[PDB]
């Protein structure tokens, strides 16, 4: 199957996701002096005071929480959005050095993680029937450079040694993801796709201008995962990123001059 290795890293993935050579794809780099300001893109709203995480999991191929998406308890509306996109997941994305681990780039530069909070459109009723929509999914996208700590990430920071391998997983309630996001939601959108298989075209990008710091300790306990399951030859879990796509005919909006 499919993974970030030399064998069956993002350069192989279109000879079973065909559509990862697509008109849509993600990520793609901002080139900030050609994105336009867009003054009719409305502010974001970002609803989470009600949010019920779940679960934590090791997908073998990132991390991710969970929460409960079956009422409109942690939802993002406005911004390019019409309708109402309820969270179902967050995970990250990260470098084996913190010169790399974004999927998107700003002005060709890469950022140590991204962290992706994943909704889908309601007016679908599942996930599964919104990624077969070009407007089912919202992801909020918001990297992560190395610097100061995050005090709201390091209660996802201790629990990793719980789900160090492939399909581990541990309760994870009563989390907050509003700590993670940055204080301005200045943002870039544009239209794309899942960033691993299938890489279905049914996503609304909304990537902040600003990110997150985290500290050096945090972001080494990331890379201290496995993308193997227990008892398999350990491979650490890093540089589970794609690469810049190309842009095609889209145009990268932007919500701030
Ligand atoms: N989805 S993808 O990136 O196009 C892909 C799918 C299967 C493979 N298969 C593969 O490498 N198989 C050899 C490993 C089997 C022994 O465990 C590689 C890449
Ligand atoms: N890295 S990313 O672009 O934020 C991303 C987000 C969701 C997913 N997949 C997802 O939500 N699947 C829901 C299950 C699909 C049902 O067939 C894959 C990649
Ligand atoms: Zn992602």
Same mark, same amino acid.
């Given at each position: ?64 929480? !969970? ?5 409109? &308890? /942690? %939802?993002?509306?406005?911004?390019? $959005? ?5 969270? *179902? ?32 459109? !309601? ?5 599964? &029937? /919104? %990624?077969?929509?070009?407007?089912? $999914? ?5 990297? *992560? ?113």
């Amino acid at each position: 199957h499919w993974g970030y290795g030399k064998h069956n890293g993002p350069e192989h993935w279109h000879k079973d996701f065909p559509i990862a050579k697509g008109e849509r794809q993600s990520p793609v780099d901002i080139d900030t002096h050609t994105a336009k300001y867009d003054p009719s893109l409305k502010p974001l709203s970002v609803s989470y005071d009600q949010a019920t995480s779940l679960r934590i999991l090791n997908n073998g191929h990132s991390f991710q929480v !969970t929460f409960d998406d079956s009422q409109d &308890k /942690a %939802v993002l509306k406005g911004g390019p $959005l019409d309708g109402t996109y309820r969270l *179902l997941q967050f995970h990250f994305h990260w470098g084996s050095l913190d010169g790399q681990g974004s999927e998107h780039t700003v002005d060709k530069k890469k950022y140590a993680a991204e962290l992706h909070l994943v909704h889908w459109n !309601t007016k679908y009723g599942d996930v599964g &029937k /919104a %990624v077969q929509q070009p407007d089912g $999914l919202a992801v909020l996208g918001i990297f *992560l450079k190395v610097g100061s700590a995050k005090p709201g990430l390091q209660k996802v920071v201790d629990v990793l040694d719980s789900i160090k391998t492939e399909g581990k997983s541990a309760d994870f309630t009563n989390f907050d993801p509003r700590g993670l996001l940055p204080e301005s939601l200045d943002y870039w959108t544009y239209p794309g796709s899942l960033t691993t298989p299938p890489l279905a075209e049914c996503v609304t990008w909304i990537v902040l201008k600003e990110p997150i710091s985290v500290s050096s300790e945090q972001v080494l306990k990331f890379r201290k995962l496995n993308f193997n399951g227990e008892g398999e030859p350990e491979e650490l879990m890093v540089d589970n990123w794609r690469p810049a796509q190309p842009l095609k005919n889209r145009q990268i909006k932007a919500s701030f001059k």
